[PDB]
Amino acid sequence: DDVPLNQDYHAKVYMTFKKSPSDGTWWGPHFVRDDKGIVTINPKSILTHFESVNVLNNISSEPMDFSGANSLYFWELFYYTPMLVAQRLLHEQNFDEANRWLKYVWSPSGYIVHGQIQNYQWNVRPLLEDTSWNSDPLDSVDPDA
Amino acid sequence: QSQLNADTVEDAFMSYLTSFEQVANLKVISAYHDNINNDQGLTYFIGLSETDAGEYYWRSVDHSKFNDGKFAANAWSEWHKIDCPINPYKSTIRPVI
Amino acid sequence: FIDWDKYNKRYSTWAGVSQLVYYPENYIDPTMRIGQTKMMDALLQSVS
Amino acid sequence: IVKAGGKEQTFTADKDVSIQPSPSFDEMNYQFNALEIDGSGLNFINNSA
Amino acid sequence: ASRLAGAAADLVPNIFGFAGGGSRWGAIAEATGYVMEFSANVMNTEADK
Amino acid sequence: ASRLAGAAADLVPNIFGFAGGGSRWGAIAEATGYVMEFSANVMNTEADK
Amino acid sequence: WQSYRTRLNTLFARQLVARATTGIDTILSMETQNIQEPQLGKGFYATFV
Amino acid sequence: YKSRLYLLWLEQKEITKQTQTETDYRYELKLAHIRYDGTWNTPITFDVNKKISELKLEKNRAPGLYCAGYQGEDTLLVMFYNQQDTLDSYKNASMQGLYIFADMASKDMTPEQSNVYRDNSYQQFDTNNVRRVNNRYAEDYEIPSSVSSRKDYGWGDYYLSMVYNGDIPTINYKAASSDLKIYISP
Structure with missing residues (x-):
């Protein structure tokens, strides 16, 4: 909040499981933010249920969400558009260009960005992590859903 | 069409990416929730494009698809276009059911 | 090997790009040009 | 290792990390502090270093 | 982009002095009507292609 | 050449006296919109030829 | 919604413009898919192991 | 602005004020950009009538229009001025400026802020007989705020481990005369 x-x-924040199903007093990370910046953990916290609780202080942005509000438009830009064009070029016997658009989703020979092979074969990162x-x-009979 | 070279599929992609830009840069103005309570029902938004004499869109989020601290991506619909001569004064516009 | 899938996997494509430095006039089309103006496109349509 | 123009500057994690993270095979995020780089002595070729 | 720019320009009043006003009130509905009539010619041109 | 001449002629105000003004502000966007709608008929006429 | 913050827009198309000057090989890479979006108001990022 | 070609142009509108009638002029600042398919967006109108009226211009003289991109702070630097004879007359000339952000929202420049952008870009203004070209704005340097993309990487020994997905999320700098210091937090 603006005023805590x-x-x-x-x-x-706290963690619940089978043996510990509910909240306990001072059994969690208790975060304190000053008037200047940096969020720290109150040292009266008991971090038994966790291994380590880190505070990312200078990270003020998260990557794009392929399962969020604008997810449908994100999957159409990076997956459904190279797969529609390369399917369409395959039907037209235009093979050297149909290979160019299938390799915007998957290259089995890897990717070379500025003279170096990359760590991925799937160019679509929410296929790299299965999101x-x-x-x-199973609401309707839909092979895509 | 049939004759489909490398120049055509790049001009069609940039024409696709032009219309992609108009939907990604929408400004949510107001909203309306179609229930008494915020926990159930579904909320309808309204958008604004970055054109002068702008065009308004709308979509939905389903609060019954909220599970474990995050909406599922099935809650959101797509932005649907409103073909109506709308010109509100200082963003005084409301959806309602 | 960056150019492997296009102009180095096959022989017929390797002899295409490597002759294009020496004899490009075998591949010059008078009606088509990479980088032509829109007036040259409108001119070709007026005589098509 | 920071090679900014003239001389190499090396910053290790024993002195320049406030909080060492837990040991793990998955991730070990070593967030350093504000490091001091002497920008005097850069080779400006075509007004860019 | 030319119909939406011509509609908002005509919503500004053009007559000033002792008798104000002059803006065309049906300018947005004229512009959206011209785009939907032109998009019917685009879909017939795309179908002829 | 007739749309650009009719657009600039309508940007001059035509009402004078105690209440000035009268120029159509969306005249250039109306003219460029009419040329691009007419050029779609030209490209269909060239394609039919 | 009472304790949660749910993103409505995206700033992806604002930062896509710098990735689109080179070509489609740069648009449809993974560095474009790593374009980040700002945080939702006052808060912070915490890592829970 | 952010690697996309924009256009700014100042339009006048001849209005009629009353006291009998007189002819007054009203100024607007327009702004359009190019899309991906080579088409141009609708112009966005900014009310700059008070900024032009604050400049004590002559009768039929258009004001000077400075416009430059600025990679830090992500703003579009738009300033108006009274066009002078020599280049040295802009060291104390009053500027009427405004910011334009990415979502076409505008914020006026504080006069303490306009003097900062004047002192580093007054040598690119127009004089009466010399018409100059504006550069991209910078104050003495151009250093990014964060580097998050790598240039090169390498595997560990026996291909077991890897140093990968690091970034420098904070880059700061301050410089005295012939002394540059860089503050990274990698």
Whole structure:
């Protein structure tokens, strides 16, 4: 918040499981933010349920979300557009260009960006990490869903 | 069409990427939630393009598709176009059901 | 090997680009040109 | 290793990290502090270094 | 882009002095009507191609 | 050449006296919109030839 | 929504312009898919192991 | 601005004020950009009538228009001035400027801010008989705020480990006379 509810801690995260199913007193990371910047952890915190709780202080941006609000437009730009054009070029016997657009999704020979082979064969990074962007696939008979 | 070279598929991609830019740069003006309570139902938004005498879009998010701290991507619909002569004063515009 | 899939995998494509330095006039089309103006496109359509 | 023009400058993680992270095979994020680079002595070729 | 620019330019009043006003109020509905009539010719041109 | 001449002639105000003004502000965007709609008929006429 | 913050827009098309000057080989790479979006208001990023 | 060609142009509008009637003029600043398919967007209108009226211009003299991109701070630097005879007359001349952000939102320049952008770009203004070309704005240097893309990497010994997906999320600098210092937080 702009004005926190408690001075001793501004946010309380905690972890629940089978043996510990509910909240405990001072059993979590308790984050305190000053008037200047950096968020620290209140040293009265008990970090038994975690291994380490780090605070990313100078990271103020997250990468783009392929399962968020504008997810449908993101998957159409990087996956469904190179797969529609390369399918369409394959039907037209234009083979040297149809290979160029299939390799915007997957190159089995790797990728070379400025004279060096890359760590990935899948050019679409939400195929590199399998991110589900539909969790209701059996509502209708849809092979894409 | 049939004669489909490298020059045609690059001009069609940039014509695709032009219309992609108009939807990615929308400004959400107002909203309306079609329930009493915020936990259930579904909320309808309204957008604004970056053209002068701009064009307004709308879409939905389903609050029954909210699971474990995050909306599923099935909650969101696509931006649907409004073909209507709309010219509100200082973004005084509201959807309603 | 950056140019492997196009102009180095086959022999007929390797002899295409490597002769293009020495004899490009075998591949020069008087009606088509990479980088022509829109007036030359409108001129070709007026005599098509 | 920071080679900015003239002399190499080496900054190790024993003195320039506030919080060492937990040991793991998956990730070890070593966030350094604000490091000091002597920009005097850059070779400006075509007004760019 | 030319219909939306011509519509908003005609919503500004053009008569000033002792009798103000002069803006065409149906300018946006004229512009969107011209685009949808022109897009019917585009879809017939795309179908003829 | 007739759309660009009709656009600039309509940018001059035509109402004088105690209430000035009268120029159509969206005249250039109306003219360029009419040329691009007419050039779509030219390219269909050239394609039919 | 009472405790959560759900992103509505995206700033991907603002930073796509610098990736689009070179060509489609630069648009459809992974460095374009790593274009980041700003945080939602006041807050921070925390890593939980 | 952000590697896309824009255009700015100043339009006048001849209005009629009253006291009998007189002819007044109203100024607007337009702004359009190019799309990916080579087409141009609609012009965006900015009200700059108070900025032109603050400049004590002559009768039929168009004001000078400075416009430059600035990679730091991601702003479009638009300033108006009274066009002078010599180049040295702009060391104390009052500027009427405004910012233009990425979403076509405008913020006026504070007069303490306009003097900063004047002192580093007054040698690119137009005089009466000399018409100059504006460069991209910078104050003495051009250093990015963060580097997040690598140039080269390498595998570990026996291909077991890897130093990979690092970044420098914070790059700062301050410089005295002939002394540059760089502050990275990698």
